[PDB]
Design a protein around this ligand. Structure first.
Ligand SMILES: CCCCCCCC/C=C\CCCCCCCC(=O)O
Length: 131
């Protein structure tokens, strides 16, 4: 599964996705080189993710199928759920400020972890390698 420590390797269309989200030019450069590392552990229906990046170090804890709130590094708040569909984690979120939907899918491709995000018609992906 997703268990383990994962470190971001490369991105696809990420700066354009950040621009749509409204992140300023300089911040997008920083975002794209965030050194993000995720440590994922599961305990039944619940996941604990240690998110560690140049921006912050926080714990993200959620139960599959239960809504929870999550804040983006820039302060943007989302609420939504993650559910396991097949072998992927599908996340359906909504920004609290403007009510717009933000979808995220997480899947394993060989030995890489791929996250894909969609927002307002733009897609982005972040690919992680296992440490
Ligand atoms: C200044 C830097 C701005 C960074 C903007 C980030 C863009 C949006 C990213 C992804 C939203 C993913 C929502 C997932 C909730 C936590 C679950 C998980 O990551 O496994």
């Amino acid at each position: 599964a997703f268990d383990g420590t994962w470190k971001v390797d490369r991105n696809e269309n990420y700066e354009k996705f950040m621009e749509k989200m409204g992140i300023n030019v300089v911040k997008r450069k920083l975002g794209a080189h965030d050194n993000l590392k995720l440590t994922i552990t599961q305990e039944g229906n619940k996941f604990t993710v240690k998110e560690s990046s140049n921006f912050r170090n926080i714990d993200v804890v959620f139960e599959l199928g239960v809504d929870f709130a999550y804040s983006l590094a820039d302060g943007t708040e989302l609420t939504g759920t993650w559910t396991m569909e097949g072998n992927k984690l599908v996340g359906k979120f909504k920004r609290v400020d403007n009510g717009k939907e933000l979808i995220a899918v997480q899947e394993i491709s060989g030995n890489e972890l791929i996250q894909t995000y969609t927002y307002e018609g733009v897609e982005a992906k972040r690919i992680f390698k296992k440490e």
